[PDB]
């Protein structure tokens, strides 16, 4: 299709948007549920019971609700990420998904809808220890083999997210099946740092389930995507 995801955000197609109306997070920790291994991924969940939790502002229209949030790496801290800035790569990336509460009745039309989703992705980039991470990262021996969860509770997104909010922003895909055009992508400049061992973890889940043939993941991103002819607008000048 034409509108795609991931691409290669380049200092050259960047056009500054100054009608961008500032963009306001704010999420309930209280609405976290449960950690996972998706088979591809893993994911935080949350209760999405009709609450203030979600975003708005910036290139949204109206409110959107806190879904959920995964992770992409590789077998390796030089690459990882599914965007590029300018062809250079981070060792991860961090998606917060929103779906579009207003135009939609649920997520799983949203996902698929029009404009049913708002993405904020965040690079993130070995340096400092990162203490809101440690949470999830001492659960991940739990999960492991595919399909496999444990409970959670009390969590906020934001503090995976960086002080400046400087983003880029354009319309996008799914970056993994049924890849719908249906995401408002938001990516953040800043990128946020954790340690190589909170990374390491990540790499000793498995694309396999219990009782099968010990499949490694890694490299669970997507090849970048040409920006077409959609316009990449940044919220910075
Ligand atoms: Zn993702």
């Not at 998706?38 to 203030?52: N, Y």
């Not at 991470?133 to 659960?139: A, G, R, T």
């Amino acid at each position: 299709g034409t509108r795609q995801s991931p691409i290669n955000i380049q200092w050259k197609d960047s056009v500054y948007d100054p009608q961008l109306a500032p963009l306001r997070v704010s999420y309930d920790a209280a609405s976290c549920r449960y950690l996972w291994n998706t088979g591809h991924a893993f994911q935080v969940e949350f209760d999405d019971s009709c609450e203030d939790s979600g975003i708005s502002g910036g290139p949204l229209g109206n409110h959107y609700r806190l879904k959920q949030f995964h992770f992409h790496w590789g077998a390796t801290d030089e690459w990882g990420s599914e965007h590029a800035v300018d062809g250079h790569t981070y060792p991860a990336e961090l998606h917060l998904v929103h779906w579009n509460s207003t135009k939609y009745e649920n997520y799983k039309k949203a996902s698929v809808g029009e404009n049913g989703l708002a993405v904020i992705g965040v690079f993130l980039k070995l340096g400092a220890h990162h203490q809101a991470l440690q949470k999830l990262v001492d659960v991940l021996p739990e999960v492991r083999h595919k399909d496999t969860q444990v409970a959670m509770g009390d969590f906020d997104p934001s503090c995976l997210m960086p002080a400046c909010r400087d983003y880029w922003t354009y319309p996008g895909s799914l970056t993994t099946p049924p890849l719908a055009e249906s995401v408002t992508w938001i990516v953040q400049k800043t990128p946020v740092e954790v340690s190589p061992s909170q990374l390491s973890m990540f790499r000793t889940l498995l694309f396999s389930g219990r009782g099968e043939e010990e499949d490694v993941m890694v490299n669970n991103y997507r090849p970048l995507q040409p920006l077409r002819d959609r316009k990449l607008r940044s919220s910075f000048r």
